[PDB]
PDB file of C-alpha atoms in Angstrom:
ATOM      1  CA  UNK A 147       0.000   0.000   0.000  1.00 10.69           C
ATOM      2  CA  UNK A 148       3.050   2.233   0.446  1.00 11.83           C
ATOM      3  CA  UNK A 149       3.739   2.074  -3.298  1.00  9.51           C
ATOM      4  CA  UNK A 150       2.291   1.054  -6.634  1.00 11.81           C
ATOM      5  CA  UNK A 151       5.093  -1.495  -7.112  1.00 11.54           C
ATOM      6  CA  UNK A 152       3.980  -3.884  -4.327  1.00 11.19           C
ATOM      7  CA  UNK A 153       6.859  -6.363  -4.764  1.00 13.24           C
ATOM      8  CA  UNK A 154       6.221 -10.091  -4.470  1.00 11.77           C
ATOM      9  CA  UNK A 155       7.929 -11.653  -1.457  1.00 13.79           C
ATOM     10  CA  UNK A 156      10.345 -14.456  -2.355  1.00 13.71           C
ATOM     11  CA  UNK A 157      10.728 -17.190   0.256  1.00 11.91           C
ATOM     12  CA  UNK A 158      14.492 -17.584  -0.228  1.00 11.51           C
ATOM     13  CA  UNK A 159      17.217 -14.978  -0.645  1.00 10.66           C
ATOM     14  CA  UNK A 160      18.241 -14.170  -4.210  1.00  9.35           C
ATOM     15  CA  UNK A 161      21.011 -16.422  -5.505  1.00  8.92           C
ATOM     16  CA  UNK A 162      19.685 -19.691  -4.069  1.00 11.72           C
ATOM     17  CA  UNK A 163      19.616 -22.663  -6.435  1.00 12.31           C
ATOM     18  CA  UNK A 164      16.568 -24.855  -7.111  1.00 15.79           C
ATOM     19  CA  UNK A 165      15.802 -28.514  -6.446  1.00 17.13           C
ATOM     20  CA  UNK A 166      13.152 -31.274  -6.662  1.00 18.11           C
ATOM     21  CA  UNK A 167      11.736 -31.579 -10.191  1.00 19.21           C
ATOM     22  CA  UNK A 168      13.256 -34.545 -12.014  1.00 17.75           C
ATOM     23  CA  UNK A 169      16.964 -35.340 -11.970  1.00 20.55           C
ATOM     24  CA  UNK A 170      18.087 -33.437  -8.868  1.00 23.59           C
ATOM     25  CA  UNK A 171      19.391 -36.561  -7.124  1.00 27.15           C
ATOM     26  CA  UNK A 172      20.711 -37.754 -10.497  1.00 25.79           C
ATOM     27  CA  UNK A 173      22.947 -34.666 -10.606  1.00 25.93           C
ATOM     28  CA  UNK A 174      24.718 -35.962  -7.491  1.00 24.75           C
ATOM     29  CA  UNK A 175      25.299 -39.375  -9.090  1.00 27.95           C
ATOM     30  CA  UNK A 176      26.949 -37.987 -12.231  1.00 21.35           C
ATOM     31  CA  UNK A 177      29.210 -35.842 -10.034  1.00 19.66           C
ATOM     32  CA  UNK A 178      30.637 -38.903  -8.269  1.00 22.64           C
ATOM     33  CA  UNK A 179      30.966 -40.958 -11.465  1.00 24.75           C
ATOM     34  CA  UNK A 180      32.966 -38.179 -13.136  1.00 23.10           C
ATOM     35  CA  UNK A 181      35.356 -38.118 -10.171  1.00 19.49           C
ATOM     36  CA  UNK A 182      35.471 -41.918 -10.392  1.00 19.76           C
ATOM     37  CA  UNK A 183      36.505 -41.621 -14.054  1.00 18.67           C
ATOM     38  CA  UNK A 184      39.923 -40.289 -13.018  1.00 16.27           C
ATOM     39  CA  UNK A 185      40.563 -42.890 -10.298  1.00 14.05           C
ATOM     40  CA  UNK A 186      39.638 -45.927 -12.424  1.00 13.04           C
ATOM     41  CA  UNK A 187      42.830 -45.975 -14.581  1.00 11.77           C
ATOM     42  CA  UNK A 188      44.927 -45.573 -11.408  1.00 16.21           C
ATOM     43  CA  UNK A 189      43.779 -48.966 -10.064  1.00 15.90           C
ATOM     44  CA  UNK A 190      46.075 -51.962 -10.386  1.00 15.21           C
ATOM     45  CA  UNK A 191      49.860 -52.291 -10.539  1.00 14.76           C
ATOM     46  CA  UNK A 192      49.760 -51.582 -14.286  1.00 15.05           C
ATOM     47  CA  UNK A 193      47.651 -48.471 -13.685  1.00 14.37           C
ATOM     48  CA  UNK A 194      48.664 -44.929 -14.546  1.00 12.42           C
ATOM     49  CA  UNK A 195      49.176 -41.706 -12.584  1.00 10.60           C
TER      50      UNK A 195
ATOM     51  CA  UNK B 406      66.432 -39.562 -20.742  1.00 11.53           C
ATOM     52  CA  UNK B 407      64.887 -38.056 -23.880  1.00 12.42           C
ATOM     53  CA  UNK B 408      66.401 -40.897 -25.916  1.00 14.43           C
ATOM     54  CA  UNK B 409      64.498 -43.360 -23.724  1.00 18.32           C
ATOM     55  CA  UNK B 410      61.302 -41.362 -24.297  1.00 19.50           C
ATOM     56  CA  UNK B 411      61.836 -41.209 -28.068  1.00 16.71           C
ATOM     57  CA  UNK B 412      62.143 -44.997 -28.285  1.00 18.39           C
ATOM     58  CA  UNK B 413      59.172 -45.350 -25.919  1.00 19.20           C
ATOM     59  CA  UNK B 414      56.885 -43.244 -28.126  1.00 19.87           C
ATOM     60  CA  UNK B 415      57.372 -45.713 -30.982  1.00 19.65           C
ATOM     61  CA  UNK B 416      56.472 -48.585 -28.642  1.00 23.34           C
ATOM     62  CA  UNK B 417      53.326 -46.844 -27.371  1.00 23.61           C
ATOM     63  CA  UNK B 418      52.013 -46.453 -30.927  1.00 20.94           C
ATOM     64  CA  UNK B 419      52.451 -50.225 -31.364  1.00 19.16           C
ATOM     65  CA  UNK B 420      50.041 -50.915 -28.493  1.00 18.48           C
ATOM     66  CA  UNK B 421      52.499 -51.701 -25.688  1.00 17.41           C
ATOM     67  CA  UNK B 422      51.353 -50.849 -22.179  1.00 14.92           C
ATOM     68  CA  UNK B 423      53.529 -48.090 -20.652  1.00 18.69           C
ATOM     69  CA  UNK B 424      54.267 -50.149 -17.528  1.00 22.30           C
ATOM     70  CA  UNK B 425      55.621 -52.942 -19.732  1.00 22.88           C
ATOM     71  CA  UNK B 426      57.938 -50.343 -21.276  1.00 18.16           C
ATOM     72  CA  UNK B 427      59.113 -49.161 -17.853  1.00 20.72           C
ATOM     73  CA  UNK B 428      59.585 -52.751 -16.662  1.00 21.11           C
ATOM     74  CA  UNK B 429      61.914 -53.416 -19.595  1.00 21.80           C
ATOM     75  CA  UNK B 430      64.100 -50.382 -18.924  1.00 19.87           C
ATOM     76  CA  UNK B 431      64.586 -51.280 -15.251  1.00 20.30           C
ATOM     77  CA  UNK B 432      65.802 -54.791 -16.084  1.00 18.75           C
ATOM     78  CA  UNK B 433      67.993 -53.467 -18.907  1.00 16.99           C
ATOM     79  CA  UNK B 434      69.546 -50.838 -16.621  1.00 14.87           C
ATOM     80  CA  UNK B 435      71.041 -53.418 -14.250  1.00 16.83           C
ATOM     81  CA  UNK B 436      72.358 -55.504 -17.154  1.00 17.97           C
ATOM     82  CA  UNK B 437      74.311 -52.533 -18.528  1.00 18.03           C
ATOM     83  CA  UNK B 438      75.800 -51.552 -15.160  1.00 19.60           C
ATOM     84  CA  UNK B 439      76.838 -55.127 -14.349  1.00 20.86           C
ATOM     85  CA  UNK B 440      78.470 -55.455 -17.779  1.00 17.56           C
ATOM     86  CA  UNK B 441      80.534 -52.264 -17.507  1.00 17.60           C
ATOM     87  CA  UNK B 442      81.530 -53.095 -13.921  1.00 15.71           C
ATOM     88  CA  UNK B 443      83.303 -56.268 -15.081  1.00 19.49           C
ATOM     89  CA  UNK B 444      85.210 -54.511 -17.883  1.00 18.85           C
ATOM     90  CA  UNK B 445      86.893 -51.859 -15.729  1.00 18.78           C
ATOM     91  CA  UNK B 446      90.010 -52.568 -13.671  1.00 22.99           C
ATOM     92  CA  UNK B 447      91.210 -51.429 -10.251  1.00 21.55           C
ATOM     93  CA  UNK B 448      93.927 -48.753 -10.333  1.00 22.84           C
ATOM     94  CA  UNK B 449      94.416 -48.689  -6.544  1.00 24.01           C
ATOM     95  CA  UNK B 450      97.367 -51.095  -6.838  1.00 22.69           C
ATOM     96  CA  UNK B 451      99.530 -48.224  -8.106  1.00 20.52           C
ATOM     97  CA  UNK B 452     101.490 -46.030  -5.703  1.00 20.73           C
ATOM     98  CA  UNK B 453     100.875 -42.333  -5.023  1.00 19.73           C
ATOM     99  CA  UNK B 454     103.158 -41.355  -7.919  1.00 22.29           C
ATOM    100  CA  UNK B 455     100.977 -43.055 -10.537  1.00 25.69           C
ATOM    101  CA  UNK B 456      97.764 -42.187  -8.673  1.00 22.09           C
ATOM    102  CA  UNK B 457      98.392 -38.508  -9.436  1.00 23.96           C
ATOM    103  CA  UNK B 458      98.496 -39.349 -13.154  1.00 23.33           C
ATOM    104  CA  UNK B 459      94.975 -40.809 -13.129  1.00 20.39           C
ATOM    105  CA  UNK B 460      93.754 -37.610 -11.466  1.00 21.99           C
ATOM    106  CA  UNK B 461      95.326 -35.563 -14.270  1.00 21.95           C
ATOM    107  CA  UNK B 462      93.658 -37.819 -16.850  1.00 22.70           C
ATOM    108  CA  UNK B 463      90.082 -37.312 -15.646  1.00 24.51           C
ATOM    109  CA  UNK B 464      90.717 -33.614 -14.969  1.00 26.62           C
ATOM    110  CA  UNK B 465      91.458 -32.638 -18.580  1.00 28.44           C
ATOM    111  CA  UNK B 466      88.283 -34.423 -19.714  1.00 27.54           C
ATOM    112  CA  UNK B 467      85.890 -32.436 -17.511  1.00 28.99           C
ATOM    113  CA  UNK B 468      87.693 -29.170 -18.324  1.00 29.71           C
TER     114      UNK B 468
END
């Protein structure tokens, strides 16, 4: 009422990411597999560095 | 060292695993040292007069 703008209140502070939907927990799986990709060739005595 | 890497690059392109290349250089390194160790002779039997000559021989090479 103090102004014609009347902003809409956002529950979370600006800059916060989103979640739920479909694939949010899948994003955490692909993050660990990508890190695993580097450690796989390092396994075994014939492995690399 | 670069000569070992140049000959290793040709072996990598042939499909040889790099560890198999490193395993061959380690065994070949001890065979070369043991071969040269048997060829050389001990100069410690000479006195101090001749021992100074061997020091003059290796000096002019590094200079």
